[PDB]
Design a protein around this ligand. Structure first.
Ligand SMILES: Nc1nnc(-c2ccc3[nH]cc(-c4cccc(NC5CCCC5)n4)c3c2)s1
Length: 273
């Protein structure tokens, strides 16, 4: 069913998420990505409406699939004896945000604003559909270079959204909030907002602000590049030590630094083409 329906191209990469290949759907030459995960390497399992036992990423990707382009679309999936295989959308040309920032260094604020705004819209969409990503970072964001549209990827560390405390975490440590480091406890929205402050810092400074646990706990933000006061303030707000002092998604998008955002296509014409 899958071996014949998709033509397998080169390996795009591999890691904690499994192995992802470039590929093409034979019926219409639609570009795709083919993601393989071994059953033994999945800790977090979930359950579909009908009760089949699948990797959580499949539950979460199904809950967020719709016309909205901010989250990578799950096109199909398959069970094999020892693995799951996910077929996912692939923009062409595409570049992940980690490589994009590596190549350019610190991004101009106008570009960081457009990118960050699109990440916010996408995270809001996930939260509305009951999904917490738990691994928001540059490596998990793709840029559709022609259209200037960002997409969230890798829901393999995700969870169903809930209002009670989380005591498990399997995302990236340096994007994880101080309450996780000190107490192994966090709540969904406020932890997500912390990762977003790390992401925004990363965009405007060209690197993440904290390496060591002690720096995270201390939460002192030092700017290594010229960054406007408004952007610094928003960043420091997202990285408040107390979870309850962090802004809501709404407060982030109504922040003065976030006004007059470019459209995705305007963003591509000025900054990407
Ligand atoms: N960890 C990951 N989980 N899903 C991934 C994913 C999903 C759908 C995708 N469509 C296109 C890509 C893609 C395109 C170009 C580079 C790229 N790099 C990823 C970085 C880890 C390996 C793949 N991914 C893609 C990646 S990467």
């Amino acid at each position: 069913p899958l071996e014949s329906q998709y033509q397998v191209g080169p390996l795009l990469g591999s890691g904690g998420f499994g192995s992802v290949y470039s590929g093409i759907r034979v019926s219409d030459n639609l570009p795709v990505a083919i993601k393989h995960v071994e059953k033994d390497r999945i800790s977090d399992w979930g359950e579909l409406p009908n009760g089949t036992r699948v990797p959580m990423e499949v539950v979460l990707l199904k809950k967020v699939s719709s016309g909205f382009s901010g989250v990578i679309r799950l096109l199909d999936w398959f069970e094999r004896p020892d693995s799951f295989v996910l077929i996912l959308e692939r923009p062409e040309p595409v570049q992940d945000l980690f490589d994009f920032i590596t190549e350019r260094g610190a991004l101009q604020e106008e570009l960081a604003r457009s990118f960050f705004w699109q990440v916010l819209e996408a995270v809001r969409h996930c939260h509305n559909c009951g999904v917490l990503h738990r691994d928001i970072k540059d490596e998990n964001i793709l840029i559709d270079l022609n259209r200037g549209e960002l997409k969230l990827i890798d829901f393999g560390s995700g969870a169903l959204l809930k209002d009670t405390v989380y005591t498990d975490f399997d995302g990236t440590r340096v994007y994880s909030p101080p309450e996780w480091i000190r107490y192994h406890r966090y709540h969904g929205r406020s932890a997500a907002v912390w990762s977003l402050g790390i992401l925004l810092y990363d965009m405007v400074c060209g690197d993440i602000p904290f390496e060591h646990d002690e720096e995270i706990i201390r939460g002192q933000v030092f700017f290594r590049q010229r960054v406007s006061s408004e952007c610094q303030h928003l960043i420091r707000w997202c990285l408040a030590l107390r979870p309850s002092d962090r802004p809501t998604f709404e407060e982030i998008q109504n922040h003065p630094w976030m006004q007059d955002v470019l459209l995705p296509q305007e963003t591509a014409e000025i900054h990407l083409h």
